Amino acid sequence: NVVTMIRAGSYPKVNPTPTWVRAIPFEVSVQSGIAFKVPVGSLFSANFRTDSFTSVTVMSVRAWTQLTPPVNEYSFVRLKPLFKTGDSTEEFEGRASNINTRASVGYRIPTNLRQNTVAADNVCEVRSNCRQVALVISCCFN
Amino acid sequence: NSNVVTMIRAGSYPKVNPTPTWVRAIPFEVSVQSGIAFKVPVGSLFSANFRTDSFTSVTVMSVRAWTQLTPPVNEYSFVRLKPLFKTGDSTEEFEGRASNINTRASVGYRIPTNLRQNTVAADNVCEVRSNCRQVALVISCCFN
Amino acid sequence: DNSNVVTMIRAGSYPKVNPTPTWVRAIPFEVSVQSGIAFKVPVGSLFSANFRTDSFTSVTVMSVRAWTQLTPPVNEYSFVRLKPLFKTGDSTEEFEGRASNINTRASVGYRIPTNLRQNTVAADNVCEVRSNCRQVALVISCCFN
Amino acid sequence: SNVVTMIRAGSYPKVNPTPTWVRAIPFEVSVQSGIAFKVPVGSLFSANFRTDSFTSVTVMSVRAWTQLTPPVNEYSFVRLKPLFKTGDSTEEFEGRASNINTRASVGYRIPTNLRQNTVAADNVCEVRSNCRQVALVISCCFN
Amino acid sequence: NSNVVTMIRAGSYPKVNPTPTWVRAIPFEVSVQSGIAFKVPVGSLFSANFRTDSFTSVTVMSVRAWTQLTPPVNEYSFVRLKPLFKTGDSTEEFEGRASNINTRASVGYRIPTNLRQNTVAADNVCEVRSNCRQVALVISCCFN
Amino acid sequence: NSNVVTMIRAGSYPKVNPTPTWVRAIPFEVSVQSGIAFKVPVGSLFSANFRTDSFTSVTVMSVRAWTQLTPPVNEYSFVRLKPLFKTGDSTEEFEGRASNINTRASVGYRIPSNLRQNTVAADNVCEVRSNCRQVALVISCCFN
Amino acid sequence: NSNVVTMIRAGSYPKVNPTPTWVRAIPFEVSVQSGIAFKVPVGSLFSANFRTDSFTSVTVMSVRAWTQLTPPVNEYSFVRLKPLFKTGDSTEEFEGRASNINTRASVGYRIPTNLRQNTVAADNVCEVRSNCRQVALVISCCFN
RNA sequence: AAAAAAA
RNA sequence: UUUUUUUUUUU
RNA sequence: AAAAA
RNA sequence: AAAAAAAA
RNA sequence: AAAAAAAAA
RNA sequence: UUUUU
RNA sequence: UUUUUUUUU
RNA sequence: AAAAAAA
RNA sequence: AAAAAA
RNA sequence: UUUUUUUU
RNA sequence: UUUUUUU
RNA sequence: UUUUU
RNA sequence: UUUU
Ligand SMILES: [Cl-]
Ligand SMILES: [Cl-]
Ligand SMILES: [Cl-]
Ligand SMILES: [Cl-]
Ligand SMILES: [Cl-]
Ligand SMILES: [Mg+2]
Ligand SMILES: [Mg+2]
């Protein structure tokens, strides 16, 4: 129940600024019928302990409708991946079966497409009948 | 394996945490003077140079030390550690000496589970004594 | 036996849908080659209504294969070379195949490793093609997205 | 392997620049109260589905969900009547909602013997519902 | 095992390639200043001194460094490495310090599969930081 | 697998070699006249077109030959090879004929280990005889 | 597998029946008044909308009821069922309430084998009570 | 459990 | 002496 | 482990 | 078999 | 050697 | 088989 | 088992 | 029933 | 799979 | 796991 | 009797 | 141990 | 669950 001696040897290999696999929850404002390019710079912030990083490797993206849909409609949200080497045209869509329930959808970036992205890049486009969308992006900060 | 994006059938919104915890080993040096103990400040662990400037408390698990500069002429390197705690400072002097004058001296101590509480910047980790002018510290701790 | 009438499906909540999905394909098309000159194969040749792929703007190429489409010059055997090109760096390989019969095509291909399987848009080039035949047929196993 | 490799290709293989592709096409239709709407097959051929290069398709199963809220005091329902060129059906596969804020779903599978092609002028099924829109998901084989 | 030349019943003409690929690790040195990070150019990997002057692109897999000269007086040698990528530079600082003043300081990093693309001579591999004036690098790569 | 860079706990400086060896299959053609033996030079292996302009010697292991052009009228293609050695030329005539006028002829020989020494550019590999005016050679050798 | 018509080696003329028995699950709705028990007529099961207009009798096996419309304000939906038999009505009130105001209420009962006799249009199946103005009934029954 | 049939 | 569909308790 | 159909 | 990077 | 055709008599 | 320790 | 279609050594 | 084999 | 300790 | 190999 | 890539 | 499923 |  007390301190014990450690027989430390040579000075090991160190790294003061290591990588960090994180999950960053943040929201975006969306206009109806209009696509919103989610910026990668939203992941670098003191609010996420990640303002010290300049690049990140996104592994997967997911989205949830943060506000209620227009009256008489069910919530929906689409996600279109974006890459510097070539943007995609897939519209991964998820719709709510209950008007009072969020709509969820996401996608996974293949290993061959997991490169670095800086604050000036864009993750994906977002289309929804709701005015805000909550995202939880699984990415590797480095 | 997959060569293109695939769809994830995500369900309800999960539990999230934008500011989680982080177990780390922080390498930083402190300046030690001959025949004198240096109280290692916990505030040296919160810094943008370790990505931990967003933390205000930390749970230290184990401290290790290495002499960073050469010892005085005709002497071998040594380094001592005295664990400090807010509920009561220790009187142990975990000493490690170098058997070669050109080689570092090293020593460390592990903090028991019953003594692993958070520490703020105004707190201190341990006292350091060495015949060298600088000591390299590697502290394994949990930031929260 | 099999069911001979329409049967009810007990569907549940609305699922996750995607109207514009991906497509792993093997696209055949031809290119014209001159003698002693290398022709850069454009990625835009993969996007056409003749392949049902004019809706795609990007594509991840996995492997390329080539065949000589026309007869070689007199007394010669057909050959063809391929030089992989990437936006991060052009290779210098010249994967060559020669026909052992003057009446037979020459063939060769190259596979792209998973680390170099990024996307390429229409303005990009897949590879360079050299041959003594005035036309080469290309079959490119790729993943449209 | 972190580099390009050589493929020892042989003879020229059989090629097809325009294959068939099996899909699940999502789209919506407008429905009136008391009136049955015929779903055209031509909706399956669109640039929004990457299928504007197709002229025929083999339908296998149809699924329907109510896309808007039902009238006041009611629960959502939806009915599907299959239609064929060899002869229309009289079935009305119906699904109702046990919650007013929740959709209603129903579907039907087309057997193997009735899985022939259909062109844009044809119709898939008749849809009835109390909601003013219905979301359809049709598992079909284009060719 | 045989003592004479023997015939080879060859068949059709094979698939050939006069300019193949090559898996190498290139030993070369760079000059480092105090308190300054030096960017390692990729064009150092292409030279007639390594039989690689015929390539223009290269896929780097892992980098390792060693201090090529002695550290300043009273200091132990150290070396840092910060990986750089055309899609996004890293902020890591993989450091290696020597426990003996007369011994080199070594450290290295590995590039994951999803980041192993080609690099041309204008590109840069990583930054180097060391108290020694020269550093020896061995860059395991794949010339193509 | 992994998705980010990882530290390598490198140790002592390894044994390096900037100019290594290379086992290669070199393809190249030679122009042959009817009824005349052409001595294939070893200097044809050392070329920038083969990334081998940095070598001066090579250890040949096996030689294979293919007729590159069509044979004269009414004849079938044939090709011969006579192995040459600086310690003594051989008199073998390894011949391969085609069973089809449109098809190449092919033959090859393997150099035994006891006769696998180095050859410089001024040396010759073998003599080629053919009714076709060009012959394609694929030589398996070890550059050093 | 078979792609053409095949002959059937039939025999004697079999036993036939142009109007066979049919067992069904009939979905129909009834209007209910608050505080008033509605007697469900069997004549609602005989209709062209169920392909059962040709039948004159039916053996009811089990009944299930759902509230078809929304409940009053500040109330949860409920529905009660009292089985009715020509040999003697019951006094049971199988009741089911909704735990959510937006969710239907549901309850049903099964008729024992000894009580599964035929019923004509002038007969009644059960009484329904609900705070909702319509009830959706699904009756499993054998038409004969 | 209920509808072709089969020696 | 051997099956496709309307509901359907129980292992 | 060597040759010559 | 092959110099290079690794590795109880 | 898929169907149609005598039967293990 | 034929020619070789 | 045989006559024609398709599969597989 | 669609991508690269089917030994 | 990361970061750390064994 | 990159280039050459060994009895259809 | 190898298996790996979106409905 | 947190994260992401 | 730790001072030859
Ligand atoms: Cl709402
Ligand atoms: Cl290159
Ligand atoms: Cl050649
Ligand atoms: Cl013989
Ligand atoms: Cl103890
Ligand atoms: Mg030819
Ligand atoms: Mg032949």
Swiss-Prot record, chain C:
The keyword Transmembrane helix does not apply. GO terms for molecular function: structural molecule activity. It is found in: Virion. InterPro entries: Satellite_virus_coat_sf. SUPFAM superfamilies: Satellite viruses. Keywords: Capsid protein, Virion. It comes from the Viruses. One of its GO terms (cellular component) is viral capsid. This virus depends on tobacco mosaic virus for its replication. This is Coat protein.
UniProtKB/Swiss-Prot annotation, chain D:
Gene3D superfamilies: Satellite virus coat domain. Disulfide bonds: none annotated. Keywords: Capsid protein, Virion. It is found in: Virion. GO terms for molecular function: structural molecule activity. The keyword Ribonucleoprotein does not apply. GO terms for cellular component: viral capsid. This virus depends on tobacco mosaic virus for its replication. This is Coat protein. It comes from Satellite tobacco mosaic virus (STMV).
